[PDB]
Design a protein around this motif. Structure first.
Motif, PDB file in Angstrom:
ATOM      1  N   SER C   5     -15.338   4.999  -2.573  1.00  0.00           N
ATOM      2  CA  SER C   5     -15.657   3.756  -2.439  1.00  0.00           C
ATOM      3  C   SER C   5     -15.049   2.938  -1.797  1.00  0.00           C
ATOM      4  O   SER C   5     -15.435   2.502  -0.822  1.00  0.00           O
ATOM      5  N   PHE C   6     -14.015   2.730  -2.424  1.00  0.00           N
ATOM      6  CA  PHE C   6     -12.895   1.594  -1.884  1.00  0.00           C
ATOM      7  C   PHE C   6     -11.882   2.177  -1.013  1.00  0.00           C
ATOM      8  O   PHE C   6     -11.614   3.166  -0.568  1.00  0.00           O
ATOM      9  N   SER C   7     -12.138   0.804  -0.161  1.00  0.00           N
ATOM     10  CA  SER C   7     -11.187   0.540   0.670  1.00  0.00           C
ATOM     11  C   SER C   7     -10.697  -0.665   1.205  1.00  0.00           C
ATOM     12  O   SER C   7     -11.815  -1.769   0.649  1.00  0.00           O
ATOM     13  N   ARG C   8      -9.569  -0.543   1.709  1.00  0.00           N
ATOM     14  CA  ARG C   8      -8.710  -2.037   1.252  1.00  0.00           C
ATOM     15  C   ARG C   8      -9.936  -2.662   3.140  1.00  0.00           C
ATOM     16  O   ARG C   8      -9.435  -4.424   3.129  1.00  0.00           O
ATOM     17  N   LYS C   9      -9.941  -2.046   3.722  1.00  0.00           N
ATOM     18  CA  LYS C   9     -10.257  -3.302   4.980  1.00  0.00           C
ATOM     19  C   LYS C   9     -12.100  -3.854   4.585  1.00  0.00           C
ATOM     20  O   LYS C   9     -12.548  -5.185   4.808  1.00  0.00           O
ATOM     21  N   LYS C  10     -12.509  -3.341   3.370  1.00  0.00           N
ATOM     22  CA  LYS C  10     -14.160  -3.502   3.435  1.00  0.00           C
ATOM     23  C   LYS C  10     -13.923  -4.647   1.981  1.00  0.00           C
ATOM     24  O   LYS C  10     -14.876  -5.221   1.516  1.00  0.00           O
ATOM     25  N   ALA C  11     -12.698  -5.176   2.266  1.00  0.00           N
ATOM     26  CA  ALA C  11     -12.753  -6.533   0.772  1.00  0.00           C
ATOM     27  C   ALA C  11     -12.951  -7.506   1.321  1.00  0.00           C
ATOM     28  O   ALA C  11     -12.501  -8.116   2.519  1.00  0.00           O
TER      29      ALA C  11
END
Lengths: 242, 97, 179, 212, 576
Positions: C5-11
């Motif tokens: 699920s994790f990506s830097r861009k979705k933060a």
């Protein structure tokens, strides 16, 4: 009389360098710069536009000595609609009129996190939820089109108009409006269910024989024709003494 | 409050790669695309519910839930210890509640 | 289940408290004028705490202007908002450089299960009779019970008075650990 | 059905005779354009002479259903269908008509689901009190003209065949003749339930020769 | 901790144990981040018991099972005994004793209002303006907005405002959207034997009650309104995933000859010269057309375009629903239909159902149209630049439908029939504010007493693509990378804003002199106090927005020690 009322009522500042076109416009109705409560921002969600428009409103308010701690409440209606180009400011104007007549100020529900750069602009507040206020007296609409087209309009709560007329004239108006409203609701609901809100006019209010006679008389007015019940120019009410 | 920041991220605690990537994100510098933070506390309250699963019924969901609620909590602590060690931080321990 | 699920861009970052302070005040200001929040509501003290934890000079001028330009003769609600607001401005000046504080003033609730004549099971959080504050909650926690035995505020009456007391650090004569 | 009848030449029957010559003998495609043309004359005759008046009349002034408020409409139902002399509804179905209309007023002007203030149409046996009650709960319905949907509902209720035909003409359209002529015999025997108790509005069947 | 087993929490507490609310339990855990517990944890590991003395209830599972049993059993008994005592009573006293107890529910029907401005009593309204204002203003030089409307991604101005201010539709707003989108239609006649008056599903023709419209359509309404994935059926099959271009190739191998009329043959010959061979087929009188080696040819190819989202008029919206005839719909650019609907809805919001009524008060030369567009009829432009080129059928008079002034022309030729001014601004994104400046000045000049003002624009393939190449619009593939859904892709003043979101529709206001508005008794929604345009300065970027409009606040401050007696309304009234 009208020219006297224009010189003193309406255009008392057109040739006064000490009064801003924006200040004068409000002062006409005895409102001050502090009474401009909401600013419909063009606010297109681009980097350049949203800082430029904040900066501009901010510098306007600072120059006209808007009271510290009295920011204009930004309204960014394009979070919901998107940017329809030509139509952008018309939508903003429709919402400005809805804001004046309700006192409700819609919030930018997509204002997750207001850009830190914008903090510098003290005279602008960027709400994220809807405020029910006690009343908005005036709204500023601003646009910034391609090709250096800038625009601004101020719309003032309509209740400042009725201060300028007598109780008799007001009460006559309120009666006429109540009647007109009733007929409009009738027309609207009938038109909605029978798909006939739009009714193309088959003919002009004048026949082609009267077309030139109507164009040339500035006091020509239509009357309810007895036979058809439709508004037309009668040849009797054209170049008539009465 | 003033001085407070909230960062919301999508994150499957069930995934090893998300655990490593998230702690790497928090600790990377802003130039490299991270927060350049250094945790003072970790509160790993992620859980999935298990109702009606007795010993005989333990299967895929349970082994997965166990990975979220123990194994990847140890991996997340591990990663924070590896990042702190890498940057030579011996005097700013991250409290694990 | 192990799909990333994790990506830097979705933060998504949230840090624009300087803005939200002013909208929180304005919402409070109008909820009091429109008589949604009364002087007996704890929701007024909770909002004061949250405005004080975002106190800066921009927010103080904001509050000064709004309160000072309130016409108190327009009704009881305007007199109330003016009185509170004046207090809230004094609290906000005393805490301009203080650190913001987690401080809950929510009414401590306890469970209540009722079965009516027809036998409908209704659960409700009712107020606890002895505990109407978090200080009292800690006392109740410190005393324990018989089973564990081994061998002045203005809340729910005048929220303006409880607001005035918020920046005052209450000195502890004797600690709750002695009881 | 186009069958000759002998009636006493009252104002009402003389109107009926006139309309038989001018309106009801026209072909169907010329009926509607003629009713629009003569609309004002027709209404003035109905309200003066005939037994079934023009429903949409408020304090003597000719309206349409679309230019009447919901208050106006309920009070005019009571004026035409409820007999002050006997303090009763000339027919139960006429009360059920008036109740169905006041329930529609509640539906149109309520914001949420509620309990009807007219629980049973027995409550309408004091109609003034029941009208005050509904129009005090929904005072907007005093100032708003009929929704176009509620006009169509009202005209739909007037055609209900499980009720006594309504004692008025609610609209000028292709069905004017059926509205004008149906249920025309009882009024002579019940003058209390006619606009002025005026016999001259009514049809009385009688033979030219036996009249001697 | 209590959010299932909330119902036994009181039973557990009766043993002298404590159950916590989430707020209490958060308070307890936040106590473990205080400085004292932190410095404690750094010495040796800390084990905080926040259990509330529950560890002293012996055999807790059985204890909590007992509590749940003696609550469920008690409830269930009482339900079953109530049901049997109700049935007994009903049997012994019959259904007529239970007939006078039952009550009738009133379900609300949608009563759509036109939301005219509320007029206060003269005493209240005389308290907000200064007392000197009476007789000071010339009402022939005060411009009021008397009506407005829009067509846009949330339908009308009524629905748009429900969604903007409240984030959700009322019953009136939900029915209005359901009517606009064509989900429901009115019906008045025989409907399966029984006579019915009301809404019906437009497809199934099954009755729908107003109360049932939200539960039945609100999901479909919200999914097909506002900012959303581009719907190809609304844009002549335009799919931004598959954007059709044509690449020019030189043929290497001689093509298989194909049949073609004689005229199409010498057309092929005229273009290609020797590179084509046309030969009459004596039998039928058609021609075999053979493209040879070196002949130019165009092969279609698709580009994946990265703008996939727009503010589109709700799916279902049809001008027929408002009454516009098929002959007008076939004749005109889609944009014109948004204008025609906005103009009638603006006239209805002004309480003017017959526009000819204006000619009881003003001359036919006194009703203006000052409304404009950025690009005008861009579908007609596609027709004459692209569809003509591809030899597709296009109406001969497509050119007239492209012109920005054609929307105003159709308004005059179908509704208004004025001979008043006509001043069609083109101002890109400022076209509507320039339209109000033109309309105001037209009225204050005396050339008109009523002006239609506003703006309109369409969304089409080519504009979408060109805004994308200017990088003006948000890249939808980037926004998906950032986890943004379409609805949240227009985020003004936000830290992450990255381009605007294209939309389509119209918006119209009717403005007129206050003195005429009062005479005609039309509503007055606001006073247009000021309207001004400004260019910026020397520069080489046409898209660059600038600070020219700052001039509206221009004001000399060299000598401001004493207040100017002009600003004082007592002085000015004394002079009048």
């Amino acid at each position: 009389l009208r020219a006297a009322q224009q010189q003193w009522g309406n255009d008392f500042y057109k040739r006064d360098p000490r009064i801003a076109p924006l200040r004068g416009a409000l002062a006409t109705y005895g409102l001050t710069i502090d009474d401009l409560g909401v600013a419909s921002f063009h606010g297109t969600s681009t980097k350049a536009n949203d800082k430029n428009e904040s900066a501009t409103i901010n510098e306007m308010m600072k120059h006209l000595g808007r009271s510290e701690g009295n920011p204009v409440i930004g309204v960014f209606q394009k979070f919901l609609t998107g940017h329809p180009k030509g139509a952008a400011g018309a939508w903003m104007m429709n919402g400005a009129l809805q804001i004046l007549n309700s006192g409700i100020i819609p919030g930018n529900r997509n204002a997750d996190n207001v850009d830190k750069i914008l903090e510098q602009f003290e005279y602008v507040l960027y709400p994220s939820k809807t405020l029910k206020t006690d009343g908005v007296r005036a709204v500023s609409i601003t646009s910034f089109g391609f090709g250096q087209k800038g625009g601004q309009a101020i719309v003032v709560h309509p209740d400042y108009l009725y201060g300028a007329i007598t109780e008799d004239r007001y009460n006559e108006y309120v009666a006429k409006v109540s009647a007109r409203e009733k007929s409009a609701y009738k027309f609207f609901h009938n038109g909605m269910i029978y798909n006939k809100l739009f009714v193309s006019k088959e003919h002009a209010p004048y026949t082609d024989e009267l077309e030139e006679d109507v164009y040339l008389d500035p006091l020509a007015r239509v009357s309810k024709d007895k036979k058809s019940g439709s508004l037309t120019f009668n040849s009797k009410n054209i170049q008539s003494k009465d | 409050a003033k001085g407070s920041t909230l960062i919301v991220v999508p994150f499957n605690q069930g995934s090893k790669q998300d655990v490593e990537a998230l702690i790497e994100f928090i600790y990377d510098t802003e130039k490299n695309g991270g927060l350049g933070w250094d945790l003072d506390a970790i509160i790993p309250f992620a859980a999935i519910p298990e109702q009606g699963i007795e010993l005989e019924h333990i299967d895929s969901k349970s082994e997965f839930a166990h990975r979220i609620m123990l194994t990847n909590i140890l991996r997340m602590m591990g990663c924070v210890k590896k990042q702190k060690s890498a940057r030579g931080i011996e005097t700013r321990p991250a409290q694990v509640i | 289940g192990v799909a990333t699920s994790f990506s830097r861009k979705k933060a998504r970052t949230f840090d624009s408290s300087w803005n939200w302070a002013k909208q929180s005040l304005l919402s409070l200001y109008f909820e009091i004028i429109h008589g949604v929040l009364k002087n007996v509501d704890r929701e007024v003290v909770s909002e004061a705490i949250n405005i004080m934890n975002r106190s800066n000079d921009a927010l103080i001028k904001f509050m000064e202007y709004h309160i000072s330009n309130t016409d108190e003769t327009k009704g009881e609600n305007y007199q109330l908002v003016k009185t509170l607001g004046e207090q809230l401005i004094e609290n906000c000046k005393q805490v301009l450089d203080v650190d913001p504080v987690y401080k809950d003033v929510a009414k401590p609730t306890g469970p209540k299960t009722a079965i009516d004549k027809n036998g409908n099971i209704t659960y409700s959080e009712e107020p606890r009779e002895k505990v109407r504050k978090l200080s009292q909650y800690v006392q109740e926690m410190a005393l324990g019970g018989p089973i564990t035995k081994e061998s002045e505020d203005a809340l729910d009456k005048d929220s303006t008075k409880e607001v005035a007391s918020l920046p005052n650090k209450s000195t502890i004569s004797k600690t709750v650990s002695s009881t | 059905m186009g069958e000759p009848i002998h009636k006493i030449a009252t104002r009402g029957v003389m109107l009926w005779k006139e309309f038989d010559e001018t309106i009801f003998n026209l072909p169907k495609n010329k009926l509607v354009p003629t009713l629009e043309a003569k609309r004002d004359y027709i209404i003035s005759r109905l309200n003066a002479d005939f037994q079934k008046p023009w429903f949409a009349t408020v304090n003597g002034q000719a309206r349409d259903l679309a230019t009447m408020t919901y208050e106006e409409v309920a009070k005019r139902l009571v004026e035409l269908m409820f007999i002050r002399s006997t303090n009763s509804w000339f027919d139960v179905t006429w009360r059920t008509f008036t109740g169905d209309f006041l329930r529609r007023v509640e539906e149109r002007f309520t914001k949420s689901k509620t309990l009807s203030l007219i629980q049973s149409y027995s409550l309408l046996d004091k109609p003034d009190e029941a009208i005050e009650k509904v129009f005090n709960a929904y005072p907007a319905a005093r100032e708003q003209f009929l929704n176009a949907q509620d006009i169509d509902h009202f005209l739909s209720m007037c055609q209900n065949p499980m009720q006594k035909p309504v004692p008025f003409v609610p609209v000028l359209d292709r069905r004017f003749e059926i509205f004008f002529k149906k249920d025309s015999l009882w009024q002579s025997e019940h003058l209390e339930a006619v606009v002025d108790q005026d016999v001259q509005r009514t049809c009385i069947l009688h033979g030219p020769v036996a009249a001697q | 901790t209590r959010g299932a087993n909330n119902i036994i929490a009181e039973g557990i507490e009766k043993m002298g144990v404590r159950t916590f609310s989430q707020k209490e339990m958060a308070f307890n855990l936040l106590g473990l981040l205080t400085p004292e517990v932190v410095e404690l944890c750094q010495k040796s590991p800390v084990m905080a018991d926040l259990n509330g003395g529950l560890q002293f209830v012996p055999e807790l599972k059985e204890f909590t099972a007992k509590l749940r049993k003696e609550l469920v059993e008690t409830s269930e008994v009482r339900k079953a005994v109530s049901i049997e005592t109700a049935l007994e009573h009903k049997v012994v006293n019959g259904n007529s004793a239970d007939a006078a107890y039952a009550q009738v529910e009133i379900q609300p029907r949608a009563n759509i209002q036109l939301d005219f401005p509320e007029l206060k009593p003269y005493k209240q309204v005389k308290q907000i303006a200064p007392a000197e204002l009476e007789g000071l203003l010339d009402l022939e030089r005060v411009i009021v907005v008397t009506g407005f409307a829009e067509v846009g991604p949330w339908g009308s101005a009524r629905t748009r405002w429900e969604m903007e201010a409240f984030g959700e539709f009322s019953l009136e707003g939900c029915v209005e959207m359901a009517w606009i989108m064509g989900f429901i239609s009115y019906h008045n006649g025989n409907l399966k034997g029984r006579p019915y008056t009301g809404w019906v599903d437009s497809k199934t023709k099954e009755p729908v009650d107003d109360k049932d419209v939200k539960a039945k359509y609100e999901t479909s309404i919200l999914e097909h309104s506002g900012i959303r994935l581009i719907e190809p059926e609304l844009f002549n099959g335009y799919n931004p995933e598959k954007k059709e271009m044509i690449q020019e190739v030189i043929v290497e191998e001689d093509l298989e000859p194909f049949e073609a009329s004689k005229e199409t043959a010498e057309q092929f010959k005229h273009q290609h010269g020797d590179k084509v061979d046309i030969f009459e087929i004596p039998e039928t009188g058609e021609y075999s057309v053979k493209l040879l080696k070196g002949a130019t040819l165009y092969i279609p190819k698709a580009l994946r375009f990265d703008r996939l989202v727009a503010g589109q008029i709700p799916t279902g919206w049809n001008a027929k629903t408002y009454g516009i005839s098929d002959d007008i719909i076939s004749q005109v650019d889609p944009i014109t239909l948004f204008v025609l609907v906005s103009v009638v809805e603006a006239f209805i919001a002004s309480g003017i159902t017959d526009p000819y009524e204006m000619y009881k008060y003003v001359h036919v030369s006194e009703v203006g149209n000052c409304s404009g567009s950025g690009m005008g009829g861009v579908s007609a432009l596609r027709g004459m630049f692209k569809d003509r080129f591809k030899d597709e059928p296009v109406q001969n008079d497509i050119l007239q439908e492209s012109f920005i002034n054609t929307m105003s022309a159709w308004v005059n030729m179908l509704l208004i029939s004025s001979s008043g001014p006509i001043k069609t601004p083109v101002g890109a994104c400022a076209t509507s504010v320039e339209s109000v400046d033109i309309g105001v000045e037209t009225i204050l000049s005396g050339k008109a007493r009523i002006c239609i003002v506003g703006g309109y624009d369409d969304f089409q393939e080519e504009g979408s693509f060109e805004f994308g190449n200017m990088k003006a619009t948000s890249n939808t593939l980037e926004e998906f990378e950032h986890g943004r859904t379409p609805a949240e892709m227009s985020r003004p003043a936000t830290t992450t804003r990255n381009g605007f979101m294209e939309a389509q529709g119209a918006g119209i206001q009717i403005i007129m002199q206050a003195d005429l508005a009062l005479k005609m008794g039309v509503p007055i929604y606001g006073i247009v106090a000021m309207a001004a345009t400004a260019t910026d300065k020397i520069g080489r970027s046409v898209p660059a927005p600038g600070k020219g409009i700052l001039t509206t606040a221009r004001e000399h401050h060299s000598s401001v020690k004493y207040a100017s007696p002009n600003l004082n309304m007592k002085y000015r009234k004394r002079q009048l």
